[PDB]
Design an enzyme around this catalytic site. Structure first.
Site, PDB file in Angstrom:
ATOM      1  CG  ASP A   1      -2.351   6.805   3.894  1.00 26.77           C
ATOM      2  OD1 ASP A   1      -1.420   7.583   3.932  1.00 26.77           O
ATOM      3  OD2 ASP A   1      -3.375   6.547   4.448  1.00 26.77           O
TER       4      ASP A   1
ATOM      5  CG  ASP B   1      -2.166   1.149   0.918  1.00 27.00           C
ATOM      6  OD1 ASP B   1      -2.349   1.558  -0.250  1.00 27.00           O
ATOM      7  OD2 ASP B   1      -2.477   1.708   1.864  1.00 27.00           O
TER       8      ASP B   1
END
Ligand SMILES: [Mg+2]
Length: 219
Positions: free
Chosen positions: A10, A8
């Protein structure tokens, strides 16, 4: 050994949420609406720009025309895009650059599995583009996390099955999406937030190639 790592953006690579929060807080200040704080902002994560704006307007029962609504959504995005021009390699989380170098030097594929509509730009600003074999396009994902779709997409975009992959995430929904894709999750954060049934490290400095290999071997 695992053949790919699915990242990912964030909370793993960088604090991508912060500039969105900043931009929304500025918009709200500009139009005199109070209440756009961090707990409120949690209600905007994964939510469309227009639905996010409407939530902010609702804090003050503020009524606007369609044209004014359009201007406000545009202005927040303009401010956000201006803000992210200042992203740099300094915004990379601890441990991540070295992990990326070590994965690459071991010919382990690297893919981004992020909902960020600015993923490619942000990786360019952080000078990470050259480490990434693929970026899963969130516009082509039918269902967001915790659905597995985006992790399956990220694995496929580098020519591997999710079962050949590790996924790295900081969110409960992302960990669920990794599990349900068939990839092996390693969370970053607290077991209080992410559960006691996966391997978790307290921060991204613990994501090293040696630790990921240990985890893979022990699964
Ligand atoms: Mg995350």
């Amino acid at each position: 050994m695992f053949k790919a790592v699915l990242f990912d953006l964030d909370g793993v690579i960088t604090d991508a949420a912060e500039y969105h929060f900043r931009a929304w807080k500025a918009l709200a200040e500009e139009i005199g609406i109070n209440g756009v704080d961090r707990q409120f902002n949690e209600q905007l994560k994964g939510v469309s720009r227009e639905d996010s704006l409407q939530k902010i307007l609702d804090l003050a029962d503020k009524k606007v025309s369609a044209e004014e609504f359009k201007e406000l959504a545009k202005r927040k995005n303009d401010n956000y895009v201006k803000m992210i021009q200042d992203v740099s390699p300094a915004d990379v989380y601890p441990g991540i650059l070295q992990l990326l170098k070590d994965l690459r030097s071991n010919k382990i594929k690297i893919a981004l599995a992020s909902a960020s509509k600015n993923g490619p730009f942000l990786l360019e600003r952080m000078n990470l583009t050259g480490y990434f074999d693929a970026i899963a396009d969130p516009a082509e994902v039918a269902a967001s996390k915790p659905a597995p779709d985006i992790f399956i997409a990220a694995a496929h975009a580098v020519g591997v099955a999710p079962s050949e992959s590790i996924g790295l995430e900081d969110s409960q929904a992302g960990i669920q999406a990794i599990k349900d894709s068939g990839a092996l999750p390693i969370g970053v954060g607290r077991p209080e937030d992410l559960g006691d049934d996966i391997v978790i490290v307290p921060d991204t400095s613990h994501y090293t190639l040696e630790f990921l290999k240990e985890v893979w071997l022990q699964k």
